[PDB]
Design an enzyme around this catalytic site. Structure first.
Site, PDB file in Angstrom:
ATOM      1  N   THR A 254       0.823  -1.208   0.000  1.00 14.25           N
ATOM      2  CA  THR A 254       0.000   0.000   0.000  1.00 14.25           C
ATOM      3  C   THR A 254       0.857   1.258   0.000  1.00 14.25           C
ATOM      4  O   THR A 254       0.508   2.252  -0.645  1.00 14.25           O
ATOM      5  CB  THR A 254      -0.951   0.009   1.197  1.00 14.25           C
ATOM      6  OG1 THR A 254      -0.202  -0.139   2.410  1.00 14.25           O
ATOM      7  CG2 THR A 254      -2.002  -1.084   1.073  1.00 14.25           C
ATOM      8  N   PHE A 379      -6.981   5.126   5.155  1.00 16.06           N
ATOM      9  CA  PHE A 379      -6.398   4.263   6.171  1.00 16.06           C
ATOM     10  C   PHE A 379      -7.462   3.562   7.001  1.00 16.06           C
ATOM     11  O   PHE A 379      -7.190   3.143   8.132  1.00 16.06           O
ATOM     12  CB  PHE A 379      -5.456   5.067   7.064  1.00 16.06           C
ATOM     13  CG  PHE A 379      -4.253   5.588   6.341  1.00 16.06           C
ATOM     14  CD1 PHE A 379      -3.207   4.740   6.022  1.00 16.06           C
ATOM     15  CD2 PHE A 379      -4.174   6.915   5.962  1.00 16.06           C
ATOM     16  CE1 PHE A 379      -2.097   5.210   5.347  1.00 16.06           C
ATOM     17  CE2 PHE A 379      -3.065   7.392   5.290  1.00 16.06           C
ATOM     18  CZ  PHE A 379      -2.026   6.537   4.982  1.00 16.06           C
ATOM     19  N   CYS A 386      -5.797   2.012   9.911  1.00 19.07           N
ATOM     20  CA  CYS A 386      -4.420   1.595   9.685  1.00 19.07           C
ATOM     21  C   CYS A 386      -3.499   1.980  10.831  1.00 19.07           C
ATOM     22  O   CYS A 386      -3.260   3.168  11.067  1.00 19.07           O
ATOM     23  CB  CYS A 386      -3.875   2.202   8.402  1.00 19.07           C
ATOM     24  SG  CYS A 386      -2.134   1.841   8.234  1.00 19.07           S
TER      25      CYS A 386
HETATM   26  C1  HEM Z   1      -0.222   4.349   2.055  1.00 20.29           C
HETATM   27  C2  HEM Z   1      -0.011   3.254   2.794  1.00 20.29           C
HETATM   28  C3  HEM Z   1      -1.138   2.474   3.512  1.00 20.29           C
HETATM   29  C4  HEM Z   1      -2.458   2.444   3.255  1.00 20.29           C
HETATM   30  C5  HEM Z   1      -3.253   3.164   2.143  1.00 20.29           C
HETATM   31  C6  HEM Z   1      -3.073   1.566   4.222  1.00 20.29           C
HETATM   32  C7  HEM Z   1      -4.411   1.266   4.289  1.00 20.29           C
HETATM   33  C8  HEM Z   1      -5.016   0.552   5.293  1.00 20.29           C
HETATM   34  C9  HEM Z   1      -6.440   0.349   5.457  1.00 20.29           C
HETATM   35  C10 HEM Z   1      -7.538   0.896   4.521  1.00 20.29           C
HETATM   36  C11 HEM Z   1      -6.621  -0.390   6.553  1.00 20.29           C
HETATM   37  C12 HEM Z   1      -7.963  -0.882   7.129  1.00 20.29           C
HETATM   38  C13 HEM Z   1      -8.242  -2.221   6.453  1.00 20.29           C
HETATM   39  C14 HEM Z   1      -9.530  -2.824   6.942  1.00 20.29           C
HETATM   40  O1  HEM Z   1     -10.291  -2.138   7.678  1.00 20.29           O
HETATM   41  O2  HEM Z   1      -9.793  -4.003   6.588  1.00 20.29           O
HETATM   42  C15 HEM Z   1      -5.323  -0.684   7.119  1.00 20.29           C
HETATM   43  C16 HEM Z   1      -5.082  -1.423   8.250  1.00 20.29           C
HETATM   44  C17 HEM Z   1      -3.842  -1.809   8.698  1.00 20.29           C
HETATM   45  N1  HEM Z   1      -2.624  -1.416   8.186  1.00 20.29           N
HETATM   46 FE1  HEM Z   1      -2.347  -0.175   6.616  1.00 20.29          FE
HETATM   47  N2  HEM Z   1      -2.092   1.084   5.061  1.00 20.29           N
HETATM   48  C18 HEM Z   1      -0.892   1.629   4.661  1.00 20.29           C
HETATM   49  C19 HEM Z   1       0.336   1.395   5.236  1.00 20.29           C
HETATM   50  C20 HEM Z   1       0.593   0.546   6.284  1.00 20.29           C
HETATM   51  C21 HEM Z   1       1.875   0.353   6.933  1.00 20.29           C
HETATM   52  C22 HEM Z   1       3.159   1.105   6.517  1.00 20.29           C
HETATM   53  C23 HEM Z   1       1.707  -0.564   7.905  1.00 20.29           C
HETATM   54  C24 HEM Z   1       2.732  -1.149   8.912  1.00 20.29           C
HETATM   55  C25 HEM Z   1       3.943  -0.632   9.147  1.00 20.29           C
HETATM   56  C26 HEM Z   1       0.314  -0.970   7.889  1.00 20.29           C
HETATM   57  C27 HEM Z   1      -0.276  -1.893   8.721  1.00 20.29           C
HETATM   58  C28 HEM Z   1      -1.631  -2.035   8.918  1.00 20.29           C
HETATM   59  C29 HEM Z   1      -2.269  -2.850   9.932  1.00 20.29           C
HETATM   60  C30 HEM Z   1      -1.542  -3.723  10.974  1.00 20.29           C
HETATM   61  C31 HEM Z   1      -3.590  -2.712   9.794  1.00 20.29           C
HETATM   62  C32 HEM Z   1      -4.684  -3.373  10.648  1.00 20.29           C
HETATM   63  C33 HEM Z   1      -4.879  -2.499  11.883  1.00 20.29           C
HETATM   64  C34 HEM Z   1      -5.885  -3.119  12.812  1.00 20.29           C
HETATM   65  O3  HEM Z   1      -6.957  -3.573  12.329  1.00 20.29           O
HETATM   66  O4  HEM Z   1      -5.618  -3.144  14.043  1.00 20.29           O
HETATM   67  N3  HEM Z   1      -0.331  -0.280   6.887  1.00 20.29           N
HETATM   68  N4  HEM Z   1      -4.363  -0.097   6.322  1.00 20.29           N
END
Ligand code: HEM
Ligand code: HEM
EC number: 1.14.14.1
Lengths: 441, 443
Positions: A254, A379, A386
């Site tokens: 992402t 996010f 996120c």
């Molecule tokens: C531009 C970069 C990123 C975008 C657009 C993005 C987008 C998202 C989105 C939309 C979700 C929610 C997904 C859902 O509700 O099913 C999410 C959750 C998450 N993201 Fe990202 N993300 C990005 C970068 C990152 C990075 C750099 C990391 C780790 C270093 C990361 C780790 C996570 C984790 C662990 C979750 C789940 C959080 C939880 O439910 O407790 N993401 N992300």
């Protein structure tokens, strides 16, 4: 009341609509035709794709809706386990890992990751300044090299050394092949399944090895020693491996898409690039950007937010109604009814952003407070938003800042936006030429 | 390194330079002589007037500079209180009111105000079509009638009914005298203060009345103020700040906008080719007896006309900044923490390095593609989170009103009006008069 539904395929209902290489863009076109909500039925499953801030702000009410595991997420759960991204909110390991890992993703924790982010960012800049004349940059390829190495380095002090490879690290190649298989079963094999388990083993063996191998300033340290303040418990080793797998996937692709889309929109909007490049020049006055200088890159962050607006690289998330509830005063939902938030369409909501939603205008984010509630969800939402948002944004701002400081960029092919779809979005075949500004590091 | 300073007057330093009827234009001439930056000293105060985009783009770095309350704003604070415009960014009521009031000023919230803007715009149009032959329009006067009534109606469902008066509403005359005393107080070393307190009371009592009067739910700013809760603190504005916001929005909502329309029409009649192009757009777009919101958004050239008018004569002609930390401006002007800056917007908007050699020409085509304008080159609405919350309000109103004016009337600069810019805390072309020949298009 009567909810629109796209064309059906007999007993397959709408499922063959996802039997395409660009399902998000297909879903967006469906959202263009059917509006803010349409029912999507597949064999044994019904969901509703939301595309308006009006409905999505209710869907984002965590007292009414909780994160659902989409079929995509359920298949990522086959190797991400009860990692943060593929766990249900009510699973003990989600809040446990959440509380344990949230301090490692704070804005204050970015300061500790910054040096290692620079380490990889410098490698990217060095790669491009070492290109010969007329040679071009494969942008998503190089952005993925960077984001993978950055999360590997910042997350568990592992160097994928992607800039020393053309064929990606065996973990990455297995991970993508797994993710591909995870996506193929959505729109769908003993060879695929054995390969899937073999790719699982390739990912897990690396991860599990490094857990046993290991104080660095990384996610793994907090995972190994962090205790959930609620339960008092640390993550067990099986969940730590799931989190590492989670962070490797969720930490790179992402973010690389964001940087890839950002650079695409910059080279397609030279006036925007000029503003971003000139900010990079005025703010990054040192050979190595400091954490505070990255925070000072206001416009670059606006460029990234606008890129995330147009092409949120995790383009959807799923929700389920915690209880019976009425969506938008007209769409009754029963307990457990599923919603899909079609983020790119949400971010094209004419009622929120105006008529020029397709234009790349970072100035939409000059004042983040001005964006209405739940209008901008790249996010995700709420406690299931996120965790890596600040990581992703700090890295992408740092890297894009350095790219703009050190290179003039040329859309030498007049690249036609071709968004390849996995579970994330990337501009496939996006290439640029970089003319070095010859600013040393 | 060594910062230029204009002529001093002994112990008064540069302060007597502002003891003039046109201090902004005086400051612009000073900027003409001294360049992109000059130190301005007065008894007990030092500030630096920036005039180049080169320095102002740094001054607009919100990590380095925050909005300062100029002495003018400090004196307006005596009756605008901790309203949005006269509050410090670190005051809890600023961010509270900021978050609470931003949804009421979205481009999408303009849709709700549009009808009441049309209500007032139609009153303006009917006033002019009801003029007899050879009668002329007092342009800033009528623009103030419109903008005051538009913010009164759109803001708190209050009809100042300025088009039913020749002498302005008692609130305005009290408001203007307050602004007058606030502006005059810059040059102050018992009758003035007693009058000042009386003018405040006239403003406060009316405002507080409508707050007490307001449980009808209107589609206005007042509703959002009474019912909006800051998502950060979870708190609504208390009634003392709501009164300050109304006072703030009544001041900030009309006169800078009326100046814009007044300057816009001035430049149009002074540039008949620009007028004709804008008039032709009004005819092409405003095909309905009443302009729709979307039609106003389609008035691209009218919008460029307004932006070019704001370029030449930004009606809030300056804003103040202070250095959050020690910082070096332009690699050559070291600033200590708390050091003040003034952004001389009309001079910024005359930066030759940004706009070319023809900065004094009125050329709306400069704004054909707004993206082309470098960052912080065009700041008629201030900067960052402290930018004009009502920018979209002002621009929608002015575009709608100017659009209808161009649709319904041919305009004549029958006096060959010589630009005379009256300076209060804002700028307006004093004595600007035109004749309108109705195109006899009904409403
Ligand atoms: C531009 C970069 C990123 C975008 C657009 C993005 C987008 C998202 C989105 C939309 C979700 C929610 C997904 C859902 O509700 O099913 C999410 C959750 C998450 N993201 Fe990202 N993300 C990005 C970068 C990152 C990075 C750099 C990391 C780790 C270093 C990361 C780790 C996570 C984790 C662990 C979750 C789940 C959080 C939880 O439910 O407790 N993401 N992300
Ligand atoms: C052409 C018309 C207008 C112009 C040129 C203009 C200009 C400005 C400028 C330059 C500032 C910043 C002042 C500073 O930083 O000290 C400002 C702030 C402000 N303006 Fe306007 N303005 C206009 C119309 C309006 C309207 C129509 C409204 C209300 C409906 C309004 C309400 C405000 C408020 C509340 C602030 C303070 C915002 C804050 O600090 O949070 N203005 N305006």
């Amino acid at each position: 009341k009567e909810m629109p539904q796209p064309k059906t395929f007999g007993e397959l209902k709408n499922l063959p609509l996802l039997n395409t290489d660009k399902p998000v863009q297909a879903l967006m076109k469906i959202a263009d035709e059917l509006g803010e909500i349409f029912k999507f039925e597949a064999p044994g499953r019904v969901t509703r794709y939301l595309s308006s801030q009006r409905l999505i702000k209710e869907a984002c009410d965590e007292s009414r809706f909780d994160k659902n595991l989409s079929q995509a997420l359920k298949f990522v759960r086959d190797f991400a386990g009860d990692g943060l991204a593929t766990s249900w909110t009510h699973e003990k390991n989600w809040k446990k890992a959440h509380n344990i890992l949230l301090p490692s993703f704070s804005q204050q924790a970015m300061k500790g990751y910054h040096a290692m982010m620079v380490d990889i960012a410098v490698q990217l800049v060095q790669k491009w300044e070492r290109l010969n004349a007329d040679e071009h940059i494969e942008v998503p390829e190089d952005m993925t090299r960077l984001t993978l190495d950055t999360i590997g380095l910042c997350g568990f002090n592992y160097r994928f050394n992607s800039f020393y490879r053309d064929q990606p690290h065996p973990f990455i190649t297995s991970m993508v092949r797994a993710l591909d298989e995870a996506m193929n079963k959505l729109q769908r094999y003993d060879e695929n399944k054995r390969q899937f388990q073999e790719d699982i083993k390739v990912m897990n063996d690396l991860v599990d090895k490094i857990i046993a191998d290991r104080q660095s300033d990384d996610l793994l340290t907090h995972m190994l020693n962090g205790k959930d303040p609620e339960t008092g418990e640390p993550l067990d080793d099986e969940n730590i491996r799931y989190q590492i797998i989670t962070f490797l996937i969720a930490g790179h692709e992402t973010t690389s898409g964001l940087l890839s889309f950002a650079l695409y929109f910059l080279v397609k909007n030279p006036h925007v690039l000029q503003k971003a490049a000139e900010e990079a020049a005025r703010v990054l006055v040192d050979p190595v950007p400091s954490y505070k200088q990255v925070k000072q890159l206001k416009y670059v962050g606006m460029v990234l937010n606008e890129a995330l607006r147009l092409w949120p690289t995790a383009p959807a998330f799923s929700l389920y109604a915690k209880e019976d509830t009425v969506l938008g005063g007209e769409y009754p939902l029963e307990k457990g009814d599923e919603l899909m938030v079609l983020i790119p369409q949400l971010h094209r909501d004419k009622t929120i952003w105006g008529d020029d939603v397709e234009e790349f205008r970072p100035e939409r984010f000059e004042n983040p407070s001005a964006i209405p509630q739940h209008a901008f969800k790249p996010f995700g939402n709420g406690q299931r938003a996120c965790i890596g948002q600040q990581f992703a944004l700090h890295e992408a701002t740092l890297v894009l800042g350095m790219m703009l400081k050190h290179f003039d960029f040329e859309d030498h092919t007049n690249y036609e936006l071709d968004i390849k779809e996995t579970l994330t979005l990337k501009p496939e075949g996006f290439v640029v030429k970089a003319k070095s500004k010859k600013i040393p590091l």
